Design a protein around this motif. Structure first.
Motif, PDB file in Angstrom:
ATOM      1  N   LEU A   4      53.986  61.874  37.663  1.00 32.89           N
ATOM      2  CA  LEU A   4      53.103  61.686  36.715  1.00 32.89           C
ATOM      3  C   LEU A   4      51.821  62.449  37.047  1.00 32.89           C
ATOM      4  O   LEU A   4      51.372  62.387  38.340  1.00 32.89           O
ATOM      5  N   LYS A   5      51.242  63.449  36.362  1.00 28.22           N
ATOM      6  CA  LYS A   5      50.122  63.913  36.407  1.00 28.22           C
ATOM      7  C   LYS A   5      49.009  63.156  35.765  1.00 28.22           C
ATOM      8  O   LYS A   5      49.027  63.110  34.694  1.00 28.22           O
ATOM      9  N   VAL A   6      48.235  62.579  36.846  1.00 28.79           N
ATOM     10  CA  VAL A   6      47.108  61.786  36.151  1.00 28.79           C
ATOM     11  C   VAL A   6      45.636  62.641  36.501  1.00 28.79           C
ATOM     12  O   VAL A   6      45.304  63.164  37.654  1.00 28.79           O
ATOM     13  N   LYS A   7      44.734  62.677  35.473  1.00 29.26           N
ATOM     14  CA  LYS A   7      43.573  63.258  35.558  1.00 29.26           C
ATOM     15  C   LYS A   7      42.255  62.365  35.065  1.00 29.26           C
ATOM     16  O   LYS A   7      42.322  61.521  34.180  1.00 29.26           O
ATOM     17  N   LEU A   8      41.501  62.088  35.991  1.00 29.24           N
ATOM     18  CA  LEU A   8      40.295  61.274  35.678  1.00 29.24           C
ATOM     19  C   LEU A   8      39.524  62.045  34.546  1.00 29.24           C
ATOM     20  O   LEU A   8      38.696  62.966  34.724  1.00 29.24           O
ATOM     21  N   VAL A   9      39.466  61.442  33.630  1.00 27.39           N
ATOM     22  CA  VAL A   9      38.594  62.121  32.511  1.00 27.39           C
ATOM     23  C   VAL A   9      37.303  61.291  32.080  1.00 27.39           C
ATOM     24  O   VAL A   9      36.254  61.897  31.639  1.00 27.39           O
ATOM     25  N   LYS A  10      37.058  59.991  32.544  1.00 27.77           N
ATOM     26  CA  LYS A  10      35.777  59.436  32.206  1.00 27.77           C
ATOM     27  C   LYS A  10      35.268  58.702  33.302  1.00 27.77           C
ATOM     28  O   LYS A  10      35.943  58.462  34.394  1.00 27.77           O
ATOM     29  N   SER A  11      34.083  58.568  33.199  1.00 28.88           N
ATOM     30  CA  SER A  11      33.178  58.005  34.521  1.00 28.88           C
ATOM     31  C   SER A  11      33.449  56.325  34.805  1.00 28.88           C
ATOM     32  O   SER A  11      33.332  55.587  33.786  1.00 28.88           O
ATOM     33  N   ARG A  30      36.670  61.969  41.464  1.00 26.66           N
ATOM     34  CA  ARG A  30      35.689  62.808  40.876  1.00 26.66           C
ATOM     35  C   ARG A  30      36.123  62.993  39.701  1.00 26.66           C
ATOM     36  O   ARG A  30      37.392  63.087  39.401  1.00 26.66           O
ATOM     37  N   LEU A  31      35.240  63.281  38.787  1.00 29.77           N
ATOM     38  CA  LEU A  31      35.619  63.717  37.420  1.00 29.77           C
ATOM     39  C   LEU A  31      36.331  64.950  36.975  1.00 29.77           C
ATOM     40  O   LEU A  31      36.046  65.867  37.935  1.00 29.77           O
ATOM     41  N   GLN A  32      37.290  64.757  36.374  1.00 30.30           N
ATOM     42  CA  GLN A  32      38.377  65.910  36.065  1.00 30.30           C
ATOM     43  C   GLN A  32      39.293  66.366  37.323  1.00 30.30           C
ATOM     44  O   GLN A  32      40.128  67.433  37.042  1.00 30.30           O
ATOM     45  N   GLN A  33      39.326  65.690  38.167  1.00 28.71           N
ATOM     46  CA  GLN A  33      40.556  65.781  39.295  1.00 28.71           C
ATOM     47  C   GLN A  33      41.658  65.515  38.817  1.00 28.71           C
ATOM     48  O   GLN A  33      41.743  64.438  38.160  1.00 28.71           O
ATOM     49  N   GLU A  34      42.711  65.976  39.159  1.00 35.13           N
ATOM     50  CA  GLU A  34      43.913  65.930  38.787  1.00 35.13           C
ATOM     51  C   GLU A  34      45.111  65.811  39.995  1.00 35.13           C
ATOM     52  O   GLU A  34      44.974  66.332  41.133  1.00 35.13           O
ATOM     53  N   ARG A  35      45.853  64.782  39.736  1.00 37.54           N
ATOM     54  CA  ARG A  35      46.915  64.486  41.081  1.00 37.54           C
ATOM     55  C   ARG A  35      48.207  64.204  40.356  1.00 37.54           C
ATOM     56  O   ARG A  35      48.528  63.741  39.325  1.00 37.54           O
ATOM     57  N   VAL A  36      49.257  64.434  41.218  1.00 41.07           N
ATOM     58  CA  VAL A  36      50.412  64.231  40.838  1.00 41.07           C
ATOM     59  C   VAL A  36      51.101  63.175  41.651  1.00 41.07           C
ATOM     60  O   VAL A  36      51.117  63.691  43.169  1.00 41.07           O
ATOM     61  N   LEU A  37      51.389  62.360  41.149  1.00 39.65           N
ATOM     62  CA  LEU A  37      51.927  61.261  41.938  1.00 39.65           C
ATOM     63  C   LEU A  37      53.539  60.899  41.637  1.00 39.65           C
ATOM     64  O   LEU A  37      53.887  61.362  40.492  1.00 39.65           O
ATOM     65  N   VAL A  54      41.707  57.719  32.252  1.00 44.07           N
ATOM     66  CA  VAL A  54      42.509  58.794  32.625  1.00 44.07           C
ATOM     67  C   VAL A  54      43.441  59.439  31.453  1.00 44.07           C
ATOM     68  O   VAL A  54      43.703  58.818  30.513  1.00 44.07           O
ATOM     69  N   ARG A  55      43.865  60.599  31.888  1.00 44.36           N
ATOM     70  CA  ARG A  55      44.758  61.432  31.055  1.00 44.36           C
ATOM     71  C   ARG A  55      46.039  61.397  31.899  1.00 44.36           C
ATOM     72  O   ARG A  55      45.952  61.554  33.013  1.00 44.36           O
ATOM     73  N   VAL A  56      47.373  61.237  31.213  1.00 43.13           N
ATOM     74  CA  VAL A  56      48.420  61.105  31.916  1.00 43.13           C
ATOM     75  C   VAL A  56      49.507  62.264  31.390  1.00 43.13           C
ATOM     76  O   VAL A  56      49.565  62.161  29.971  1.00 43.13           O
ATOM     77  N   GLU A  57      50.413  62.873  32.077  1.00 42.11           N
ATOM     78  CA  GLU A  57      51.237  63.790  31.674  1.00 42.11           C
ATOM     79  C   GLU A  57      52.556  63.643  32.378  1.00 42.11           C
ATOM     80  O   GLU A  57      52.528  63.234  33.698  1.00 42.11           O
ATOM     81  N   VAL A  58      53.704  63.566  31.932  1.00 41.69           N
ATOM     82  CA  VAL A  58      54.836  63.561  32.596  1.00 41.69           C
ATOM     83  C   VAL A  58      55.330  64.858  33.186  1.00 41.69           C
ATOM     84  O   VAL A  58      55.330  65.587  32.591  1.00 41.69           O
ATOM     85  N   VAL A  59      55.570  64.721  34.574  1.00 39.53           N
ATOM     86  CA  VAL A  59      55.794  66.069  35.200  1.00 39.53           C
ATOM     87  C   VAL A  59      57.062  65.707  36.195  1.00 39.53           C
ATOM     88  O   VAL A  59      57.376  64.613  36.074  1.00 39.53           O
ATOM     89  N   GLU A  60      57.692  66.533  36.697  1.00 40.24           N
ATOM     90  CA  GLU A  60      58.665  66.380  37.706  1.00 40.24           C
ATOM     91  C   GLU A  60      58.643  66.695  38.916  1.00 40.24           C
ATOM     92  O   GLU A  60      57.544  67.419  39.626  1.00 40.24           O
TER      93      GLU A  60
END
Length: 60
Positions: A4-11, A30-37, A54-60
């Motif tokens: 899952l790619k997770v991005k912190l979009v709110k404080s 920190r804001l707008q950091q993205e992580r693939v977990l 957070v914002r979530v996207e399905v990735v592989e």
């Protein structure tokens, strides 16, 4: 390992300790950091706790 790619979009400033702990566990610092977990039940539980933040996207 589906992932899952997770991005912190709110404080998270001033948020409850549970929610700040879930961010910790997702490594979002920190804001707008993205992580693939790895998409696990456990990682999903932490994203669920911080859904507003957070914002979530399905990735592989």
């Amino acid at each position: 390992m589906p992932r899952l790619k997770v991005k912190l979009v709110k404080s998270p400033i001033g948020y409850p300790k549970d929610q700040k702990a879930a961010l910790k566990a997702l490594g979002l610092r920190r804001l707008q950091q993205e992580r693939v977990l790895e998409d696990t039940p456990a990682i999903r539980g932490n994203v669920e706790k911080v859904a507003h933040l957070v914002r979530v996207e399905v990735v592989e």
